[PDB]
């Protein structure tokens, strides 16, 4: 198991200052039911698997500290006709990974059984679906085939979860500069685990 390296000691470290809704039990639960998060590959992937999906919510979520996004559009994709907008709902991000849009509410809560699409802001009231979400984001959007593959792409999981906005833009502005925390503390966390982060990282 992926928990046999990160201890409750070693995600209290990375996340000192985590708002208390998300816990370390709360992941490690949510994670049973995507059992090859974590377990895919060699150790070496399972670490970078770890480092890489924690790294980005280090990133998203400021040290796990905001469960909302900080000060937000209603993200109502309208040309996004699947997963139909509810009446007065917002989409902002939520939970760790800052779960964005009627189109990854919407999809998220037909594979996880949950009202999201009508009720987005139960990512942010339920500890259990708002690590639920990150894990169906990460899994389903295949961030984890990015990261576990050999060789390893951090950069991958970067342009699937935010690409649009922190890929491809010009060094030093903002969206170049949140892609490079998103690096920073992925390789952080790689050094913690003693694992080599691999070398295609930034987009
Ligand atoms: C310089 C720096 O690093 N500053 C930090 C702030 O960036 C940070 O605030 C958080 O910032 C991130 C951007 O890095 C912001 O992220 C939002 O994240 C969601 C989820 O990934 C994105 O949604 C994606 O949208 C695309 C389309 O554009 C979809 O294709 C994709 O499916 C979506 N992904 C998901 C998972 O749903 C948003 O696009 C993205 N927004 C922007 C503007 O880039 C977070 O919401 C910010 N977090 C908070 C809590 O507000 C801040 C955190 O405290 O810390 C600074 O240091």
Same mark, same amino acid.
């Given at each position: 198991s992926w928990t046999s390296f990160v201890t409750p000691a070693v995600f209290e470290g990375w996340? !000192?200052?985590?708002?208390?809704?998300?816990t370390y039990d709360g992941l490690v639960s949510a994670s049973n039911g995507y059992p090859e998060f974590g377990t895919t590959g060699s150790l070496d992937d399972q670490k970078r698997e770890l480092a890489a999906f924690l790294g980005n919510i280090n990133q998203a979520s400021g040290g796990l500290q905001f469960i909302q996004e900080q000060?937000?559009?209603?993200?109502?994709? &309208?040309?996004? &006709?699947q997963y139909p907008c509810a009446a007065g709902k917002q989409y902002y991000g939520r939970g760790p990974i800052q779960l964005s849009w009627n189109y990854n509410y919407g999809e998220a809560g037909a594979d996880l059984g949950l009202d999201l699409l009508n009720n987005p802001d139960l990512v942010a009231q339920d500890s259990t679906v708002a690590w639920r979400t990150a894990l169906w984001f990460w899994m389903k959007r295949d961030c984890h085939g990015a990261i576990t593959?050999? !060789? !390893?792409?951090?950069s991958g999981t970067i342009r699937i979860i935010?690409?649009?906005?922190?890929?491809?833009? !010009?060094?030093?502005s903002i969206g170049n500069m949140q892609m490079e925390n998103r690096v920073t503390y992925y390789t952080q966390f790689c050094q913690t685990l003693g694992v080599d982060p691999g070398t295609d990282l930034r987009c």
């Open positions: 996340f !000192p200052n985590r708002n208390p809704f998300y000060n937000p559009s209603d993200y109502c994709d &309208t040309s996004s &006709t593959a050999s !060789p !390893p792409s951090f935010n690409g649009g906005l922190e890929c491809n833009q !010009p060094a030093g």
